[PDB]
């Protein structure tokens, strides 16, 4: 949740709650689809606590969580059009000690549009 | 990153499909493969290149080496139509493929 109508340049938040598991125990990945159906990295948190991002929202988006409350967390920033599309969060199952990074959904969705 | 080909497959039901990836480098064999039914969420198939995910029938299969990595349905079935997408997840960042739609030939 969080999504909606976007104005170009503004800012949201989405959320993505988790239930049947531990937050510290895997990770969690923030993917989006657009509307041409393309699929795209977002964000990705390591085990430790770093993250990575690729160019495309270096800068603007941040991802964040609670282990806690159990809650992933985007925060985009300075939004454009081309981040209009479907956003996903997945757990990973892969351990990339031993070189994998496979990706476990289990998100419905929440459709940003900025226009 | 990834490149995947075909685009498009047109197959009829009990045929054999292949959809294949391709790395810009090495990746060894860290390379998943989704399938997105048409309005749902993707969802996993095979992970570690040729390992099937649970629930996921024998009749899908994961090979590949180096940088090219193969998803093969050897008797293709009604359920098995939408995008499959393969990924690696060798190193980050993390990237997948443009996707490959698989539509049931029919009379």
């Known amino acids: 949740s969080g999504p909606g109508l976007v104005q170009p340049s503004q800012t949201l938040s989405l959320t993505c709650t988790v239930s049947?598991?531990?937050?510290?125990?895997?990770?969690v990945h923030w993917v989006r689809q657009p509307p041409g159906k393309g699929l795209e990295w977002l964000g990705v948190?390591?085990?430790?606590?770093?993250?990575s991002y690729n160019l495309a929202l270096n800068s603007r988006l941040s991802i964040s969580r609670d282990t806690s409350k159990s809650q992933v967390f985007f925060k985009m920033s300075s939004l454009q059009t081309e981040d209009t599309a479907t956003y996903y969060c997945?757990?990973?199952?892969?351990?990339?000690?031993?070189?994998?990074?496979?990706?476990?959904?289990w998100g419905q969705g929440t459709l940003v549009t900025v226009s | 990153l990834m490149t995947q080909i075909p685009a498009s497959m047109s197959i009829s039901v009990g045929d054999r499909v292949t959809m294949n990836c391709k790395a810009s480098?090495?990746?060894?064999?860290?390379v998943d493969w989704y399938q997105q039914k048409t309005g749902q969420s993707p969802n996993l198939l095979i992970y570690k290149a040729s390992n099937r995910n649970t629930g996921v029938p024998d009749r899908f299969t994961g090979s590949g080496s180096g940088t090219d990595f193969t998803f093969t349905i050897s008797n293709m079935q009604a359920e098995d139509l939408a995008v499959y997408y393969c990924m690696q997840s060798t190193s980050y960042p993390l990237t997948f493929g443009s996707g490959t739609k698989l539509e049931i030939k029919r009379a």
């Open positions: 480098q090495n990746v060894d064999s860290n």
């Open positions: 997945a757990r990973p199952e892969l351990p990339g000690l031993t070189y994998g990074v496979w990706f476990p959904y």
């Open positions: 948190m390591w085990n430790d606590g770093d993250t």
């Open positions: 049947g598991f531990s937050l510290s125990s895997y990770h």
